[PDB]
Structure 1
Amino acid sequence: RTDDLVYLNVMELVRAVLELKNELAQLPPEGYVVVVKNVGLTLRKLIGSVDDLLPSLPSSSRTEIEGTQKLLNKDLAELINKMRLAQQNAVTSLSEECKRQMLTASHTLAVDAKNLLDAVDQAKVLA
């Protein structure tokens, strides 16, 4: 884009999700919370910028976008649960698997962010 906000926003969340692997390896367990809080905040920002530019779109394809938005919050809620397991097992031999499931949740949150991008995108069918 040249001024698309919802896009730049989606690309931010995708970037924050992309930065997770290195951070879980350089941060102590205590720090995993702040990292996910950022993903958390970047998501809320996005979900918000979409809600604003939502009434400017066909009052039809609205049930479709609201559909992914609810999906995203589901995604984050799961990422948090995983992150909590990732913590409780910081010094057990289940560390790697916990982190692995954390990253898997994060990847699906970006995949869903991208699906959201596309939905609101194609939604330029109105004007």
Structure 2
Amino acid sequence: NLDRTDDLVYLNVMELVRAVLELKNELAQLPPEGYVVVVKNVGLTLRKLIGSVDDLLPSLPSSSRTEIEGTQKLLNKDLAELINKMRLAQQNAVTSLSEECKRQMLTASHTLAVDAKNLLDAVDQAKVLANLA
């Protein structure tokens, strides 16, 4: 089917989605310090992802290029939101509202992982239409 051999966009989407699933399982049992770290890795994998998307762009149909650049900005918003919720989680670590901002962290990072997965499909789609065009 698909050859992922030198496919960094693929690699970084997977690394990111993995990092999100890690947070999802660990958020329950991590002190405030412990999730700061996992979100920081989510940040890093994302900037790697965005990076490898940038290097790939020039080589696609303009239509796709424009759309993908759009989802890049969206991915960053998703990260901005995740960090927001992590801050809430932190200042509410001893309040009855602790549990809810852990739920919103999981939501935020879940929508980020999904948007990354959606981008992989868009990129894969674009690579194919490039072959056709």
TM interval, short-chain normalised: over 0.9
Distance (Å, rounded) in 1 between the aligned partners of 2:24 and 2:110: 10
Identity of aligned residues (%): 100
Q: Which has the higher helix share?
A: 2
Which TM-score applies when normalising by structure 1? Answer: 0.93
Distance (Å, rounded) in 1 between the aligned partners of 2:126 and 2:11: 17
Cα pair 2:13 2:117 within 8 Å, conserved: yes
RMSD: 1.4
Cα deviations by residue, 1:72-110 (Å, 9 ceiling, x for unpaired)? 000000000000001111111111111001100000001
Mean alpha-carbon deviation: is it higher for 2-11 or for 41-50?
2-11
Aligned length: 127
Match of 2:60, SS state, is coil
Distance (Å, rounded) in 2 between the aligned partners of 1:108 and 1:46: 16
Distance (Å, rounded) in 2 between the aligned partners of 1:102 and 1:84: 9
Deviant stretches of 4+, over 3 Å: none
Mean alpha-carbon deviation: is it higher for 42-51 or for 54-63?
54-63
Mean alpha-carbon deviation: is it higher for 20-29 or for 4-13?
20-29
Q: How far apart are 1:59 and its partner, in Å? A: 2.9
Cα pair 1:32 1:87 within 8 Å, conserved: no
Structure 1, unpaired ranges of 5+: none
Cα deviations by residue, 1:19-51 (Å, 9 ceiling, x for unpaired)? 112322232112322211110000000011010
Structure 2, unpaired ranges of 5+: none
Which TM-score applies when normalising by structure 2? Answer: 0.89
